[PDB]
Amino acid sequence: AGGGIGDEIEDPAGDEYELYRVVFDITFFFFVIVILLAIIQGLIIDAFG
């Protein structure tokens, strides 16, 4: 997605579990995308170095 699931869900603004879903989305987004693609980038970067 490049942006987490949030473009590929129902809108979570319904009252039940809104904040629960939002921490879920943002935690998923942050952790997997930025940290692990950065791990990959840094690995080949350190390889050239």
Partner: peptide, 23 residues
Amino acid sequence: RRLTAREAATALAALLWAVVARA
């Protein structure tokens, strides 16, 4: 752990160990 007052009065221990506002 209680919606509106979740981060505040529902769980202050984890709110102090970390500082989240949605759990």
